[PDB]
């Protein structure tokens, strides 16, 4: 333990813009020394819910690979990011497996994302034909057909555009304002170590 290297958690957490729900960006973290002391200590964290490891004994474990996912959802939907849940956003946008390892951090961000004039660049999928598998992403915007008759070209009857737009304004009460969500995933003790920090004394 010297230590010199530093993982870029800040770059994950202090980005100017996060991606939409249906196109969440996944970042790899490797070949660095991870320091969670600056992470958990920060003030405005709302829900630091952690599943496979205790949120304090992170610093004494060495991880084979770390992946970070970030997006922005409504406050009411934050409970749907836990494993085993079921809903519109837990079936059509993003779901976690039943054997999940790693854990999640969600914090309110109404001061930055929302605009008084109307922010219309945060989309989410509303229709789909079947439930998706864990950690799967799709981007295609093919016109979803509902009737038994085939559809093509432009929308109309039983031909709906599968993406709507969030309406984020400061006037909305608690439960509709955006909550920035970050999910960390990793594996334990089956491969050569790549990411871990020093143990304090």
């Amino acid at each position, epitope marked *: 333990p010297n230590i010199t290297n530093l993982c870029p958690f800040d770059e994950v957490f202090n980005a100017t813009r996060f991606a939409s729900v249906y196109a969440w960006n996944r970042k790899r973290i490797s070949n660095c020394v991870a320091d969670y002391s600056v992470l958990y200590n920060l003030a405005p964290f709302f829900t630091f819910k952690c599943y496979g490891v205790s949120p304090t004994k992170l610093n004494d474990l060495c991880f084979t690979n770390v992946y970070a996912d970030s997006f922005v959802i409504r406050g009411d939907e934050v409970r749907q990011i836990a494993p085993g849940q079921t809903g519109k956003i837990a079936d059509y946008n993003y779901k976690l497996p039943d054997d999940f390892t790693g854990c999640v951090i969600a914090w309110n961000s109404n001061n930055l994302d929302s605009k008084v004039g109307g922010n219309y660049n945060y989309l989410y999928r509303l229709f789909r034909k079947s439930n998706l598998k864990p950690f799967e992403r799709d981007i295609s915007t093919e016109i979803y057909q509902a*009737g038994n008759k085939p559809c093509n070209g432009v929308a109309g009857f039983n031909c709906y555009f599968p993406l709507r737009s969030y309406s984020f304004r400061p006037t909305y009460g608690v439960g509709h304002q955006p909550y920035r969500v970050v999910v960390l995933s990793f594996e334990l003790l089956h491969a050569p170590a790549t990411v871990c920090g020093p143990k304090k004394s």
Partner: antibody
Amino acid sequence: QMQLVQSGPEVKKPGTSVKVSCKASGFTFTDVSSLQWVRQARGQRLEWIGWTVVGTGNTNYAPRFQERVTITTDKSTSTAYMELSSLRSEDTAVYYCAAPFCSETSCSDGFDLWGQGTKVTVS
Amino acid sequence: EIVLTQSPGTLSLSPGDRATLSCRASQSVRISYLAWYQQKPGQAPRLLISGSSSRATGIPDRFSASGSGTDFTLTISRLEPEDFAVYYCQQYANSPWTFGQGTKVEV
């Protein structure tokens, strides 16, 4: 059984605004269901108002009603609302709301269900 | 935007014969987005045939729809004493939807 019940007969004065509702019975608007509004006199041609999708919220209007009518939906209690402004004495008619059988996966292509009709008289 | 002219205006056949009705448009033609309703006196209209191949639930096998281009035709095998009412054509595909004019069938 599956059925839609509307409001009661209404009498209104010229100039003011009117507000009409129709709600399902043993039936939910879910997410794919549509709903169209029509207007019809005493034994004359059917007139079309507009239709809205409860899910995406996108709406459509006839060019004659582009300025003085509003269509609204409510998933909470599964109801549909029309708001009409600047009523006139020649608008005395019956208004209907229609929607097909439809539940959460995929559904029909014809306006099967129809309302009981509410008489709106202006004088 | 589109208009659906109906014909003939009035039809009068004995109960038991086959009857036919036609409605035609002028602008762009769509096939599977046509429906035929009937309005009993004083009550809301009900769906009979839609999509030219799928009938409504509970409607008997008597009615039959067809038509490919501008013209569309509805055929009734026989006239039961309750089958006397007005008929309307409707389309969904094109610009703001419009209804037909209304034809009556007599005995």
